[PDB]
């Protein structure tokens, strides 16, 4: 699975000293592009993208997102009028991109949200814009009569994919690397309860399975994951806890399944 993802937010309330429009690009979860309404320029966010592109590329990308900023500026006015609202805290969100699956087949998305709730989604197959809400019906007729569906189908199926294949090749050293996590497991006692905590520090790539074992057997009872959260250096962290009976510290182990490990790693307190 390979993914190219463009996500952008137009805000009424960023707020103080922060940009109202922020647009960012993602290749396989990795941030490579940034645009904001203050700077008014599209900038690289990784070393692998900056080394493989000239300023002729970035000026061209700047012209596109500057247009996208002004469209989403007016969208804030339009949808507040659509919902009969004045001022306040409001957001327009866009999610655009394409997938190259393990199958070798291509998925494509271009969908929006108003105030964190699904507004419209483009159907690549039928070449129509789906309206998730009754207030999104006037958007549907405006968008389809604009005739954007023709070009957007071609972009998501061809142009987006061509760029993504090129980006995967540009940043192969970073995207294909394997980083082994330093794993620790800690025990703490609250009120009449032992809570055990497992932490995987600094792993890449993102996919990871972290399970608890009691006497060898896998336990999901009173287990909780904090998901996969990022570090500042492009590596990942994950935090998994389990509630247990007091005294049972030596019974528990933390099973880590990751690409950097040829066999699963077990860790104890």
């Amino acid at each position: 699975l390979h993914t190219l993802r463009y996500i952008r937010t137009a805000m009424t309330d960023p707020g103080p000293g922060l940009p109202w429009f922020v647009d960012v690009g993602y290749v396989d979860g990795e941030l490579f592009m940034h645009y904001n309404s203050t700077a008014r320029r599209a900038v690289p966010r990784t070393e692998w993208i900056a080394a493989n592109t000239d300023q002729q590329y970035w000026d061209r990308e700047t012209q596109i997102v500057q247009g996208s900023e002004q469209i989403n500026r007016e969208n804030l006015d339009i949808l507040r009028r659509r919902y009969n609202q004045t001022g306040g805290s409001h957001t327009v969100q866009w999610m655009s991109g394409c997938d190259i699956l393990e199958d070798g087949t291509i998925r494509g998305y271009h969908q929006a949200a108003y105030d964190g709730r699904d507004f419209v989604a483009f159907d690549k197959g039928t070449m129509t814009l789906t309206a998730a809400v009754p207030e999104a019906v006037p958007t549907k007729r405006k968008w389809e009569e604009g005739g954007y569906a023709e070009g957007l189908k071609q972009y998501l199926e061809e142009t987006c994919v061509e760029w993504l294949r090129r980006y995967v090749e540009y940043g192969k050293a970073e995207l294909g690397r394997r980083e082994r996590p330093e794993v620790r497991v800690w025990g703490k006692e609250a009120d009449g309860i032992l809570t055990l905590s497992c932490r995987a520090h600094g792993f890449y790539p993102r996919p990871i399975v972290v399970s608890w074992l009691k006497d060898g057997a896998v336990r999901g009872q009173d287990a909780q994951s904090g998901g996969i959260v990022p570090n500042g250096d492009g590596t990942y962290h994950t935090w998994v806890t389990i509630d247990a009976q007091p005294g049972d510290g030596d019974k528990y182990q933390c099973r880590v399944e990751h690409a950097s490990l040829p066999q699963p790693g077990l860790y104890s307190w």
């Binding site: 990308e61 989403n72 655009s96």
Partner: peptide, 11 residues
């Protein structure tokens, strides 16, 4: 690798 058509953002 953005699309030339930024009008596709119209709501």
């Amino acid at each position: 690798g953005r699309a030339e058509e930024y009008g596709a953002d119209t709501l």
